[PDB]
Curated annotation (Swiss-Prot), chain C:
It comes from Homo sapiens (Human). The MIDAS-like motif in the VWFA domain binds divalent metal cations and is required to promote trafficking of the alpha-1 (CACNA1) subunit to the plasma membrane by an integrin-like switch. It is found in: Membrane; Cell membrane. Isoform 1 is expressed in skeletal muscle. Isoform 2 is expressed in the central nervous system. Isoform 2, isoform 4 and isoform 5 are expressed in neuroblastoma cells. Isoform 3, isoform 4 and isoform 5 are expressed in the aorta. It is linked to Developmental and epileptic encephalopathy 110: A form of epileptic encephalopathy, a heterogeneous group of early-onset epilepsies characterized by refractory seizures, neurodevelopmental impairment, and poor prognosis. Development is normal prior to seizure onset, after which cognitive and motor delays become apparent. DEE110 is an autosomal recessive form characterized by profound global developmental delay and hypotonia apparent in infancy followed by onset of seizures in the first months or years of life. Proteolytically processed into subunits alpha-2-1 and delta-1 that are disulfide-linked. A motif (MIDAS-like motif) lies at residues 8-12. The alpha-2/delta subunit of voltage-dependent calcium channels regulates calcium current density and activation/inactivation kinetics of the calcium channel. Plays an important role in excitation-contraction coupling. Dimer formed of alpha-2-1 and delta-1 chains; disulfide-linked. Voltage-dependent calcium channels are multisubunit complexes, consisting of alpha-1 (CACNA1), alpha-2 (CACNA2D), beta (CACNB) and delta (CACNA2D) subunits in a 1:1:1:1 ratio. Glycans are attached at N73, N97. The lineage of its organism: Eukaryota, Metazoa, Chordata, Craniata, Vertebrata. Belongs to the calcium channel subunit alpha-2/delta family. A divalent metal cation binds at D8, S10, S12.
Swiss-Prot record, chain D:
The gene is CACNA1D. It comes from Homo sapiens (Human). Belongs to the calcium channel alpha-1 subunit (TC 1.A.1.11) family. CACNA1D subfamily. Ca(2+) binds at E170. This is Voltage-dependent L-type calcium channel subunit alpha-1D. Voltage-dependent calcium channels are multisubunit complexes, consisting of alpha-1, alpha-2, beta and delta subunits in a 1:1:1:1 ratio. The channel activity is directed by the pore-forming and voltage-sensitive alpha-1 subunit. In many cases, this subunit is sufficient to generate voltage-sensitive calcium channel activity. The auxiliary subunits beta and alpha-2/delta linked by a disulfide bridge regulate the channel activity. Channel activity is further modulated, depending on the presence of specific delta subunit isoforms.
UniProtKB/Swiss-Prot annotation, chain F:
It is found in: Membrane. It is linked to Sinoatrial node dysfunction and deafness: A disease characterized by congenital severe to profound deafness without vestibular dysfunction, associated with episodic syncope due to intermittent pronounced bradycardia. Belongs to the calcium channel alpha-1 subunit (TC 1.A.1.11) family. CACNA1D subfamily. It comes from the Eukaryota. Each of the four internal repeats contains five hydrophobic transmembrane segments (S1, S2, S3, S5, S6) and one positively charged transmembrane segment (S4). S4 segments probably represent the voltage-sensor and are characterized by a series of positively charged amino acids at every third position. The chain crosses the membrane at residues 7-31. Expressed in pancreatic islets and in brain, where it has been seen in cerebral cortex, hippocampus, basal ganglia, habenula and thalamus. Expressed in the small cell lung carcinoma cell line SCC-9. No expression in skeletal muscle. Changing A28G: Found in a patient with autism spectrum disorder; likely pathogenic; gain of function; increases channel activity; the mutant channel is activated at less depolarized potentials with an increased current density and impaired channel inactivation. This is Voltage-dependent L-type calcium channel subunit alpha-1D. The gene is CACNA1D. Changing I29M: In PASNA; the mutant channel is activated at less depolarized potentials; results in increased current density. The chain holds residues 722 to 769 of 2161 of the full protein.
Length: 119, 143, 201, 222, 48, 48, 48, 158
């Protein structure tokens, strides 16, 4: 009802221009299709949790702090590339060195923790 | 009451330190066990309670200040704990005795100003704390 | 032997060291035969029997089963009083209304540590050292073992340490070396042949 | 099968990199170009072999000279390393001093037997009965081994490694409670033998991980 | 869990450390106008 | 189960409040004593 | 040597990235809202 | 005598001596060979004698009252006295088996003699010594916080 009222009242040609208005549209559309599916589906359930995120931009200062730091992170993309290269090099070396250690259950090289795959 | 400023405020601070030492000596035995040291320390705590009440009633002229507020809140809760212990989680009501070492900062202004500065340097972190609260809530619901 | 077992069931023995105490008592009853009389008592600010016996019993197969069940159903709560606990133990070794062995009279204390020596109790009850006192320090702790060691050799006893499960079996059988001291001094009068009860080989 | 396909891919990749160094060499007659030849050389020589396989990981480093931003950030990192070398030397010397003190304090005292009943090597031999999970009715036979701790203070290198692990704030309580129980040169531990020895660990943590590590970040910031 | 660690801890630790750094500088550039650095400088300038 | 989980706030408060003090004590000592030393070098180098 | 070197390198690079991000926008971290700022101009623009 | 102590060869000779002291200190290990213990315990003696000879030369070459003020050399006399006390203490009728490992630390602190001429380490040390009062105040407040929470934990989970 909120969506239909706002799209009627806010000239839908420019309604989708804002980021917030488009964001909540995807939330309800994913949520509105699950009403008949109650009797895959789990992915659309997480959409309705995201409505709380819009409440983060309702305060003066917590929104601008985030804006400034994500803008700063976007302004320096090559610094994280050093971390990425370090991770790549050390992962490849770990593959080549300790990639043949057997996986057991009582040790720190187990099925969840080993050098047998890049991820 | 009568003018007693330089000896009184350092004697009471020494009393605070002695109470801290006495609280440190006590051994929390399991399942209501005890020894002789705790048997003596209960009477020591009694004497500390009477001396604290005496020095509180001496200077009442006092409640509006927060530090003095805590100062007599500790005394009154200790008195109530003693009354309830004698008239028998009553033993847990003595956990307020742990705040007595905190009274020592009120006796040293040079450290009181440092504590005030550290506390006042916390307001800018409230936005980050609020952001952490939203992140925790959102991830808890997602999980 | 007219054995009597004192078990410390005060508050400080709650936890792991109570499990070791119960196992140590059970393994110690396994070293008693039909000619030995045993009874188990506890003390925590008050000394009382752990079972329905209230005096020394023959310690046959049926009676040991009752004592083991009673020992395996004790809880730790209260304060420690060695003066009250030892007076109860010495009083059950002076009964003489009931059938006993009229032989080795030993008190075994299963405690962890403490500060009371109970010098007045020992002087009041056994001035002539007619009763041996074996003291055990059971569990992993840092309590004072001084008084426990003193009670042992002041009354012709011995001191044992049980810090783990693996030390239970070897320490509950070493008290027969102390009891065998008067036998070796007898000489040829102690070289008599005895026959056991019927048992499966 | 996957490696055979991927090995075929490397053959074409190592040829394009080979045809561009020669093409560049035609028009010329720095240290980054030598690195590019080094990577191509290893692949051709590979065609022991384990060392060359390890050195094959130098492929991403060839992109530093291409992107300007990567070169700039690498140069900035090197400059930051140079300007902060004073603090690293001081904290390394402090760790060395604490390692020497720890060697003097816990030299060989971290030994223990497989069963907590034998407290010297002359007794920690043969087999013993193990009671699983504390149950007296579930015994099992196990060997007796007189083994040293994984992280100990035997010599200077071991002490430095143990102190590094402590300064990373990981697994330090276990080392603390292992050092508290340390009795003597070649005998087993006792529960809470010397609690006052924890002053060494507390002082080391406060001096290095809280002071000399926060001063690192503060110096970077300033 | 990987996203929770990066956003919840790495990002927030950057939040706190940055705010703290920007708060220390405020009081550093205010007490500097008093002359606290001069007192240290004057004491050290006469040691040589 | 039960109301025993309410004691978890002791370790939640101790971690959050304890770690805040550490970042406001050891970091403050470093920051306010490194800018002082850094500024001394600028004064000492120029005066040299 | 593999694990020790990785830990040291990763810690240093993370510190470097954090400090670079903090210093990229340092005016906001020392804004001193009392005097003035872009927020005042933005409010002016919105009201206008 | 002032010509030698202010020369360039004397400083490097002292550097070599302190490097040898550090090498002797950082060579002990579990199950060390029996021939190395004697080397260590004679090197300690001879190097202590040489260091105390150097110290007495330094004391009676410039001025007694001009060195006590400076904190850089103030603890050097204490270190030398402790070293010279350790030898007689060990060799006399006082064994002190743990006393060997407590007297090696004061001899170990001699490594700091290499960090005198830095102009960057000492620059921060000056500010640290100036603000030591605030440093101690902050540390004492942290200690009080830890004590309060330890007492509360003792009360709750004791
Ligand atoms: C390696 C992990 C930890 O990822 C990092 O953050 C980097 C790779 N290194 P780091 O050594 O991490 C530990 C420090 O985190 C501080 N912390 C956390 C939460 C809080 O609320 N308050 C607070 O102070 C601390 C508890 F103090 C610790 O000392 O980072 C440092 C950054 C600044 C100063 C010193 C260390
Ligand atoms: C790229 C080469 C520099 C890496 C490096 O070398 C050092 C030598 C001595 C002391 C520190 C370093 C260092 C670091 O960058 C470094 C090392 C550590 I360990 C370190 O602290 C470990 C993380 N943290 C655990 C919570 C310590 C408190 C930090 I922050 C930075
Ligand atoms: C048996 O033990 C009792 C106490 O356990 C001793 O005390 C006597 O108990 C009987 C039973 O009533 C009575 O004779 C008296 O009440 C008690 N005193 C005396 C002097 O007899 C008793 O002495 C012990 N022996 C006998 C044969 O009873
Ligand atoms: Ca007890």
């Amino acid at each position: 009802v909120e969506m239909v009222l706002k799209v009627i009242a806010f000239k839908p040609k420019g309604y989708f221009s804002d980021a917030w208005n488009t964001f909540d549209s995807l939330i309800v559309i994913g949520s509105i299709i699950d009403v008949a599916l109650s009797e895959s589906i789990t992915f659309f359930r997480l959409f309705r949790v995201m409505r709380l995120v819009k409440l983060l931009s309702r305060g003066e200062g917590i929104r601008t702090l985030l804006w400034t730091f994500i803008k700063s992170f976007q302004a320096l993309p090559y610094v994280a590339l050093l971390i990425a290269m370090l991770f790549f090099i050390y992962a490849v070396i770990g593959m080549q060195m300790f990639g043949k250690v057997a996986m057991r259950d009582n040790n720190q090289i187990n099925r969840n923790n080993n050098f047998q795959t890049f991820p | 009451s009568i003018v007693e400023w330089k000896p009184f405020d350092i004697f009471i601070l020494l009393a605070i330190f002695a109470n801290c030492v006495a609280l440190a000596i006590y051994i929390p035995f399991p399942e209501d066990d005890s020894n002789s040291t705790n048997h003596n320390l209960e009477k020591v705590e009694y004497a500390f309670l009477i001396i604290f009440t005496v020095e509180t009633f001496l200077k009442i002229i006092y409640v509006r200040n927060g530090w003095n507020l805590l100062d007599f809140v500790i005394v009154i809760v200790g008195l109530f704990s003693v009354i309830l212990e004698q008239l028998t989680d009553v033993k847990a009501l003595r956990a307020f005795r742990v705040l007595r070492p905190l009274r020592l900062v009120s006796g040293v202004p040079s450290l009181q100003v440092v504590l005030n500065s550290i506390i006042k340097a916390m307001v800018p972190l409230l936005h980050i704390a609020l952001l952490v609260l939203f992140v925790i809530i959102i991830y808890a619901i997602i999980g | 032997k007219d054995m009597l077992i004192l078990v410390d069931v005060s508050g400080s023995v709650s936890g792991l060291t109570l499990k070791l105490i119960r196992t140590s008592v059970s393994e110690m009853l396994e070293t008693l035969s039909d000619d030995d009389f045993v009874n188990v008592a506890s003390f925590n600010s008050n000394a009382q029997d752990v079972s329905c016996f209230q005096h020394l019993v023959q310690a046959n197969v049926r009676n040991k089963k009752v004592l083991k069940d009673a020992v395996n159903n004790i809880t730790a709560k209260g304060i420690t009083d060695y003066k009250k606990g030892f007076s109860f133990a010495f009083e059950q070794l002076l009964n003489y209304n009931v059938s006993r062995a009229n032989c080795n009279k030993i008190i075994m204390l299963f405690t962890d540590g403490g500060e009371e020596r109970a010098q007045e109790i020992f002087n009041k009850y056994n001035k002539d050292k007619k009763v041996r006192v074996f003291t055990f320090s059971v569990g992993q702790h840092n309590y004072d073992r001084g008084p426990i060691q003193w009670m042992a050799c002041e009354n012709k006893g011995y001191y044992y340490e049980i810090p783990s499960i693996g030390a239970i079996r070897i320490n509950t059988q070493e008290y027969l070396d102390v009891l065998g001291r008067p036998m070796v001094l007898a000489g040829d009068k102690a070289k008599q042949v005895q026959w056991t009860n019927v048992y499966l080989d | 099968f996957r490696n055979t396909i991927l090995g075929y891919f490397d053959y074409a990749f190592t040829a394009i990199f080979t045809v561009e160094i020669l093409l560049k060499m035609t028009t010329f007659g720095n240290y980054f170009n030598l690195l590019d030849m080094l990577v191509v050389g290893v692949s051709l020589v590979s065609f022991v072999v384990k060392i060359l396989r390890v050195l094959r990981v130098l492929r991403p480093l060839r992109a530093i000279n291409r992107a300007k931003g990567l070169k700039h950030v690498v140069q900035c990192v090197f400059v930051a390393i140079r300007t902060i070398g004073n603090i690293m030397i001081v904290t390394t010397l402090l760790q060395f001093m604490f390692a020497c003190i720890g060697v003097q304090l816990f030299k060989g005292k971290f030994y223990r037997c497989t069963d907590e009943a034998k407290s010297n090597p002359e007794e920690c031999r043969g087999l013993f009965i193990l009671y699983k999970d504390g149950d007296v009715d579930s015994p099992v036979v196990r060997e007796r081994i007189w083994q040293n701790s994984d992280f100990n203070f035997d010599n200077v290198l071991s002490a430095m490694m143990a102190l590094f692990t402590v300064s990373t704030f990981e697994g330090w309580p276990a080392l603390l409670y292992k050092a508290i129980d340390s009795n003597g040169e070649n005998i087993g531990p006792i529960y809470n033998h010397r609690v006052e020895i924890s002053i060494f660990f507390i002082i080391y943590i406060i001096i290095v991980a809280f002071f000399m590590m926060n001063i690192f970040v503060g110096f970077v910031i300033v | 869990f990987v996203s929770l660690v990066i956003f919840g801890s790495f990002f927030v630790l950057n939040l706190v450390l940055g705010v703290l750094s920007g708060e220390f500088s405020k009081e550093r550039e205010k007490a500097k106008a008093r002359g606290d650095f001069q007192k240290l400088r004057e004491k050290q300038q006469l040691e040589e | 189960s039960s109301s025993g989980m309410i004691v978890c706030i002791y370790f939640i408060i101790l971690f959050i409040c304890g770690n805040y003090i550490l970042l406001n004590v050891f970091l403050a000592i470093a920051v306010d004593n490194l800018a002082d030393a850094e500024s001394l070098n600028t004064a000492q180098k120029e005066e040299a | 040597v593999y694990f020790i070197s990785f830990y040291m390198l990763c810690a240093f690079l993370i510190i470097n990235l954090f400090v670079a991000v903090i210093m990229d926008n340092f005016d906001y971290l020392t804004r001193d809202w009392s005097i003035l700022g872009p927020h005042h101009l933005d409010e002016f623009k919105r009201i206008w | 005598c002032r010509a030698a102590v202010k020369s360039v060869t004397f400083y490097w000779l002292v550097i070599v001596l302190v490097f040898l002291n550090t090498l002797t200190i950082s060579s002990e290990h579990y199950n060390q060979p029996d021939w190395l213990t004697q080397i260590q315990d004679i090197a300690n003696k001879v190097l202590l004698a040489l260091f105390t000879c150097e110290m007495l030369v330094k004391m009676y070459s410039l001025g007694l009252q001009a060195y006590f003020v400076s904190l850089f050399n103030r603890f050097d006399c204490f270190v030398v006295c402790g070293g010279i006390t350790e030898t007689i203490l060990v060799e006399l009728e006082i064994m002190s088996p743990l006393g060997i490992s407590v007297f090696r630390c004061v001899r170990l602190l001699r490594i700091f003699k290499v960090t005198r001429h830095w102009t960057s380490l000492s620059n921060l040390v000056a500010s640290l010594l100036n603000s030591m009062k605030s440093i101690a105040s902050l540390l004492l407040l942290l200690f009080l916080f830890i004590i309060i929470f330890s007492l509360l934990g003792m009360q709750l989970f004791g």
